[PDB]
Ligand binder design. Structure first.
Ligand SMILES: COC(=O)N[C@H](C(=O)N[C@H](C(=O)N[C@@H](Cc1ccccc1)[C@H](O)C(=O)N1CSC(C)(C)[C@H]1C(=O)NCC(C)(C)C)C(C)(C)C)c1ccccc1
Lengths: 116, 116
C-alpha cells in the first residue's frame, strides 16, 4: 500500500517476525528509510540465544551496549505479501523495546519513496 | 522522483536550505521516514545565532546536548519543485552536522512510502 508521510503520525506496519529461536510473533514496526538495518526487540528471542556485540550510531549518539546482532537470520512476513523477507542478520534492541523495519527489509519487499 | 531503497546506499537528495540567518546553501540530506522532524547542520549558522536547547529521542537514546531548535522558520528548496517547503522549526545537529529530511518536510511535498 501507499503510506502517507505525516509528522504527527508515525508510519507503522504490523509484521510477523520469526527470530527462529521462538514462536513467530506479530509486532507493530516503524517503517524507516533512514535505518540501514532492521531492529527487533530482544523480547521476541528466547532467553539463552547467542547474540553478538555491536556498535551502533544513532542521533542520540554512538552505543556499544544497547544493540546486539542476531546469529540466525530473521524471517519477516508483511500483511500484504505471502513470501517472507529473509534478513541474514539484523539488530536486536536489548534496552528500549524498539521494532524498526529498515532498508534491508524494504529492499526485499521492493518498497520505494515517491516524491511527486 | 521514485527513490528505491537499498541497505547499502542511503536515500539522499540535494536541497537548498535557507536558515534566514545567512544565504541559502546546498546540502545533501538523508530521506528519513523515521524522523518526526527535519535535522539541519549547525554549520549552516553563524557562530552566534540564538538556538533553544531541546531533547530528542534517537537510537543512542535520549539526547539533550546534541540538537537545538531553530528560532526562525527554515525554507527548503528541492531540485524538482519551485515552491520551497517552509518548516516552522526544525532540529539543528550541533554534534555531527547531519542533514535529515523528516516527515514534516515530506508531508509538505506530498511524499509517500509505497510498498507493492
Ligand atoms: C518527542 O519528539 C521525538 O523524540 N521524536 C523522535 C524522532 O523522530 N527521532 C528521530 C530519529 O532518530 N529517528 C530514527 C528512528 C528512531 C526513532 C526513535 C528512537 C530510535 C530510532 C531515524 O529514522 C533513523 O533511523 N536514523 C536517524 S540517525 C541514523 C543513523 C541515520 C538512523 C538510525 O538511527 N540508525 C540506527 C538504527 C538502524 C539502529 C535505527 C530524529 C532525531 C532523527 C528526528 C521520536 C520519538 C519516539 C518514536 C519515534 C521518533
Amino acid at each position: 500500500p501507499v503510506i502517507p508521510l505525516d509528522p504527527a503520525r508515525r508510519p507503522v506496519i504490523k509484521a510477523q517476525v520469526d527470530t527462529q529461536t521462538s514462536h513467530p510473533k506479530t509486532i507493530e514496526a516503524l517503517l524507516d528509510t533512514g535505518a540501514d538495518m532492521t531492529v527487533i526487540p530482544i523480547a521476541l528471542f528466547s532467553s539463552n540465544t547467542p547474540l553478538k556485540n555491536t556498535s551502533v550510531l544513532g542521533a542520540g549518539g554512538q552505543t556499544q551496549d544497547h544493540f546486539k546482532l542476531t546469529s540466525l537470520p530473521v524471517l519477516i512476513r508483511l500483511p500484504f505479501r505471502t513470501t517472507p523477507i529473509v534478513l541474514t542478520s539484523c539488530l536486536v534492541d536489548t534496552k528500549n523495546n524498539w521494532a524498526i523495519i529498515g532498508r534491508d527489509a524494504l529492499q526485499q519487499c521492493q518498497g520505494v519513496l515517491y516524491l511527486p
